[PDB]
C-alpha cells in the first residue's frame, strides 16, 4: 500500500543527516573572528533614474558596465546610460504584468516575461533602426519568475508551474525540462562557468541543476519560509538565498552544509533581492521595509545602511567590475551608488 | 555635453521623455479592475455580455466616456498567494458566485473569507456579484431544499427593510436575503473603515452591471478623497 | 534599406531647384539626414544637417542664406532648397543616415546621388599623406591621415572614419571611431592611432579593395573631409 514508500523515506533520510551532520566540524564564526573587519562603510546617492510611470521589478546590468535595463507595470522596458543618465531605447510591450527581464551578455538581447506564460525575445540591433520581437516562447502553463541567458541561442526560465525548461532560441522549442518541485519555483542564479545552476521555490527548498544531462544533484533545505531571491557566489562554489522570514543564508556546494545566517531581532518583513560584490566580501539584500541594507559575508555583522526608497525595493544589481550598485523600488527611481 | 555627438544623445533622450509623458498621460486616465470567481459561477457569461494556454485576458468597456480595464486570470496555477501582489493598486475587485447550488457554497464563503482578509489587498473595496439568481427561482418552487445543508436557515426572518421586487414567493425572498446576509456578514467583523462590499442580484442577462459597476466605483472614489482631505 | 533620390540636371545660373531624397524600408522618423557633398573631382564635403525630430539644423558656411532643408515625416520623403545657383553647384549630391546614441554607428547607407550642372578659418584642416600608390594582391597596404588639432574628447574618444567609395560605386564605411569595425566588411581591415596621426592598415589584398579613400572628423560641428588615395593594381 504506502508501507514501503515512508520506510526507505527515512532510511534514506538517516543514511544521509548522519554523514551531514558528521561532516560539520565547526562553524566558519570560529575562523572568522580572528580577521580584522572592515567597520563602517558610507555609500552616497550619485545619480538617481526617473521615467517610469507604475512599479518596477527588475534589472540586469549589462557586460559592458555601463548600460543597464528595467521593465514595469505600465508595459515598458528603457535601457538606460549609467553614466550621462541617458535612455537608449523605450520598448513597448504586450502584456502588462512583466515580471522580469534579461540582458545578453553578447548585448545583443533582452527578454522579459511574466502572467501570461510566455517569455519573448527583442532583437536589439537591427537594419531597420528599430526594437522588435523575434522569437516568443509559448508551453509553459504557470507565470514566469525568472530568466537568464547562456549565450545568444540558450536560454533558462523559471515558471510557476514548478518545472524549470532549458529552451533553444532558435527553433522556439524545449530542449529539455527540470522536475521536481513541488512548489512554484521563484528564481534561478547561473554558475560562472554556464555548466550547472540553483534553484528555488516556495518549498522552502533549494536544488541544484546540471543542465547537459538535464538531472538534478543536490538537495538543499533548512528555510522556514519561501524563497523569492538567490545568488551565485562569484567563486563558483556557493550562494545565497533570500526568503520572507527576515533571514539569508549561505550555502556550499561541495560540502552540503549551511553556513552563517544573516539575521537580526529589529527586522521583521521580508528580503526581495540578494547579490554579492565582486570579491564576495560585501553582501547587499534589500527589504520590505523600504530601506536596503550591507552585511559582512565573513563576519555576518551589519556595517552601515543605505535609506532613501521611499517603498519597497524590488530589484538589486551590481556592476561586473564592482564599480556601481544600483537599486530599484516601488516608487519607480533607481538610485545609483557609489 | 561636449561633442556634437552628446548633444544628440540628449536631444534623443527628451524625445524619449515626450513620449513618456504622453503615455501617463493615457495611463492616468483609466481604471483597472479585477474579477475573481469560480468556474460553476457564470462569470464566463457575463464577460461575454459586456462584450492557446494563455495566462491572462483582457476586456474593455466604457460608460460615460470613461475607460474600465477589466483582467480575467486564465489558465493559471489553484495557489493564487503569490500573483496577488501585482493587483494592490486597482480601483475594485468584481466577486461572483452561484447561489443555485446551496452545498458547494461553504467553499466561495470561505474564498471569499481569504481575499477580504489578505495582507496586500487591504484598502482595495470589493464588488459582490450573486448570479443566476432565476435558477434559484426554478429550484425553490418545488422543494432539494437549504435546511439540508443549512440548518439555520429556520430560524432566520425577512428583515424590515428588505424590498422585493417580484413578490413572486415570499420564502424566495427569505432564502434570497439569508444568503446575502450570509455572505454580507464576513465584511462586517473587519475592515475598519477602509474598504466596504456591495451587493446585487444578478441573472444570465442583465444589461444593467455596466452601471452598477460605475456607481459602485465612483462611490469608491469619492469616500476615498473624503477620507484623504479631512472631511470624513 | 534603400534610399532613392531623383531630379537633377542642366540649368542655367541663378535658378533655384527642389531635391526630394526618397526613403523606404527603415524607421526614417528615427535618423538624422545629413547632406554630405562631393565634388565632381575632388573630396568629400557637407551640405546641411537637420536632426531626427527637427530640432536642430546646421548649415555649411559656403551656403547658409540660400539652402533650406526640410523633412515630411509622414510621407517619409527628404527635401533640399537652393537659390540663385552659382558656378560650384557641379556637385555630386548624396543621402547619407546616422544615430547617435551609447555605441551607435553613424553614417552607415548612402544613396547613389543625383548629377547638376550649371553652365557658365578656425575648422580643423586634414590633409592626406599621399594620392596614389601601387600595390600587389596579398601585400600589406598603408595609408596615413593628418588631423590639424587633437581629435581626442575628454570622454576617451576619437572622431575618425575611413570611407573607402569604390570606383562606379557610393561610399561606404569600413572603420568609424577610429579602431571599430563596420557592418559586415572583411575583417582584414584595421585601424590605428596616436591623437593626431592615424594609419589605415589592410592585411591581405584583393581585387575588391581598389578605389579612393577618405578621411573624415567629427568632433566639432563642421565636417571636413581628406583629398583621397586612389589604389591601382
Known amino acids: 500500500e504506502l508501507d514501503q514508500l515512508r520506510q526507505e523515506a527515512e532510511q534514506l533520510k538517516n543514511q544521509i543527516r548522519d554523514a551531514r551532520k558528521a561532516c560539520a566540524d565547526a562553524t566558519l564564526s570560529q575562523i572568522t573572528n580572528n580577521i580584522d573587519p572592515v567597520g563602517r562603510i558610507q555609500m552616497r546617492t550619485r545619480r538617481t533614474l526617473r521615467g517610469h510611470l507604475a512599479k518596477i521589478y527588475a534589472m540586469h546590468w549589462g557586460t559592458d558596465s555601463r548600460l543597464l535595463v528595467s521593465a514595469s507595470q505600465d508595459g515598458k522596458l528603457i535601457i538606460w546610460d549609467s553614466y550621462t543618465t541617458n535612455k537608449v531605447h523605450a520598448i513597448p510591450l504586450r502584456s502588462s504584468w512583466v515580471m522580469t527581464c534579461a540582458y545578453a551578455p553578447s548585448g545583443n538581447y533582452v527578454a522579459c516575461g511574466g502572467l501570461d506564460n510566455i517569455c519573448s525575445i527583442y532583437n536589439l540591433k537591427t537594419r531597420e533602426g528599430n526594437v522588435r520581437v523575434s522569437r516568443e516562447l509559448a508551453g509553459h502553463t504557470g507565470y514566469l519568475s525568472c530568466c537568464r541567458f547562456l549565450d545568444d541561442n540558450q536560454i533558462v526560465t523559471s515558471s510557476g508551474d514548478t518545472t524549470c525548461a532549458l529552451w533553444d532560441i532558435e527553433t522556439g522549442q524545449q530542449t529539455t525540462t527540470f522536475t521536481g518541485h513541488t512548489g512554484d519555483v521563484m528564481s534561478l542564479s547561473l554558475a560562472p562557468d554556464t555548466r550547472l545552476f540553483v534553484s528555488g521555490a516556495c518549498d522552502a527548498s533549494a536544488k541544484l541543476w546540471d543542465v547537459r544531462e538535464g538531472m538534478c544533484r543536490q538537495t538543499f533545505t533548512g528555510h522556514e519560509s519561501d524563497i523569492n531571491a538567490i545568488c551565485f557566489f562569484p567563486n563558483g562554489n556557493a550562494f545565497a538565498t533570500g526568503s520572507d522570514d527576515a533571514t539569508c543564508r549561505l550555502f556550499d556546494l561541495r560540502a552540503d552544509q549551511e553556513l552563517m545566517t544573516y539575521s537580526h531581532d529589529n527586522i521583521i518583513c521580508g528580503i526581495t533581492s540578494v547579490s554579492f560584490s565582486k570579491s564576495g566580501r560585501l553582501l547587499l539584500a534589500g527589504y520590505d521595509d523600504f530601506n536596503c541594507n550591507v552585511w559582512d559575508a565573513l563576519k555576518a555583522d551589519r556595517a552601515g545602511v543605505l535609506a532613501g526608497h521611499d517603498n519597497r525595493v524590488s530589484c538589486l544589481g551590481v556592476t561586473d567590475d564592482g564599480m556601481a550598485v544600483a537599486t530599484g523600488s516601488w516608487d519607480s527611481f533607481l538610485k545609483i551608488w557609489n | 555635453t561636449l561633442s556634437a555627438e552628446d548633444k544628440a544623445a540628449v536631444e534623443r533622450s527628451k524625445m524619449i521623455e515626450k513620449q513618456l509623458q504622453k503615455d501617463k498621460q493615457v495611463y492616468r486616465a483609466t481604471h483597472r479592475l479585477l474579477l475573481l470567481g469560480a468556474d460553476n459561477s457564470g462569470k464566463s457569461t457575463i464577460v461575454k455580455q459586456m462584450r492557446k494556454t494563455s495566462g491572462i485576458f483582457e476586456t474593455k468597456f466604457q460608460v460615460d466616456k470613461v475607460n474600465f480595464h477589466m483582467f480575467d486570470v486564465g489558465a493559471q496555477r489553484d495557489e493564487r498567494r503569490k500573483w496577488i501582489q501585482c493587483f494592490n493598486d486597482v480601483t475594485a475587485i468584481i466577486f461572483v458566485v452561484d447561489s443555485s447550488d446551496y452545498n458547494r457554497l461553504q467553499e466561495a464563503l470561505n474564498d471569499f473569507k481569504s481575499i477580504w482578509n489578505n495582507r496586500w489587498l487591504r484598502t482595495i473595496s470589493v464588488i459582490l456579484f450573486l448570479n443566476k439568481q432565476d435558477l434559484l427561482a426554478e429550484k425553490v418552487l418545488a422543494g432539494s431544499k437549504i435546511e439540508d445543508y443549512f440548518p439555520e436557515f429556520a430560524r432566520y426572518t425577512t428583515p424590515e427593510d428588505a424590498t422585493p421586487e417580484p413578490g413572486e414567493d415570499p420564502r424566495v425572498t427569505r432564502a434570497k436575503y439569508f444568503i446575502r446576509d450570509e455572505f454580507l456578514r464576513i465584511s462586517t467583523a473587519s475592515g475598519d473603515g477602509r474598504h466596504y462590499c456591495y451587493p446585487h442580484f444578478t441573472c444570465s442577462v442583465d444589461t444593467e452591471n455596466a452601471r452598477r459597476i460605475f456607481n459602485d466605483c465612483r462611490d469608491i472614489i469619492q469616500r476615498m478623497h473624503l477620507r484623504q482631505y479631512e472631511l470624513l | 534599406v534603400q534610399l532613392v533620390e531623383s531630379g537633377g540636371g542642366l540649368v542655367q545660373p541663378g535658378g533655384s531647384r527642389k531635391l526630394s531624397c526618397s526613403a523606404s524600408?527603415?524607421?526614417?522618423?528615427?535618423?538624422?539626414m545629413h547632406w554630405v557633398r562631393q565634388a565632381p573631382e575632388k573630396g568629400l564635403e557637407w551640405v546641411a544637417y537637420?536632426?531626427?525630430?527637427?530640432?536642430?539644423?546646421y548649415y555649411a558656411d559656403t551656403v547658409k542664406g540660400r539652402f533650406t532643408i526640410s523633412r515630411d515625416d509622414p510621407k517619409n520623403t527628404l527635401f533640399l532648397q537652393m537659390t540663385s545657383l552659382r558656378s560650384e553647384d557641379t556637385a555630386m549630391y548624396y543621402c547619407?543616415?546616422?544615430?547617435?546614441?551609447?555605441?551607435?554607428?553613424?553614417?552607415?547607407?548612402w544613396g547613389q546621388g543625383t548629377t547638376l550642372t550649371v553652365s557658365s578659418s578656425s575648422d580643423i584642416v586634414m590633409t592626406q599623406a599621399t594620392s596614389s600608390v601601387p600595390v600587389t594582391p596579398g601585400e600589406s597596404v598603408s595609408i596615413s591621415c593628418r588631423s590639424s588639432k587633437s581629435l581626442l574628447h575628454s570622454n576617451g574618444n576619437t572622431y575618425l572614419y575611413w570611407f573607402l567609395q569604390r570606383p562606379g560605386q557610393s561610399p561606404q564605411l569600413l572603420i568609424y571611431?577610429?579602431?571599430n569595425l563596420a557592418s559586415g566588411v572583411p575583417d582584414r581591415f584595421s585601424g590605428s592611432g596616436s591623437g593626431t596621426a592615424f594609419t589605415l592598415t589592410i592585411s591581405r589584398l584583393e581585387a575588391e579593395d581598389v578605389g579612393v579613400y577618405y578621411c573624415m572628423q567629427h568632433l566639432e560641428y563642421p565636417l571636413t573631409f581628406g583629398a583621397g588615395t586612389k589604389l591601382e593594381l
Open positions: 571611431r577610429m579602431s
Open positions: 537637420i536632426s531626427s525630430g527637427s530640432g536642430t539644423i
Open positions: 524600408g527603415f524607421a526614417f522618423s528615427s535618423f538624422g
Open positions: 547619407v543616415r546616422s544615430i547617435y546614441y551609447y555605441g551607435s554607428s553613424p553614417f552607415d547607407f
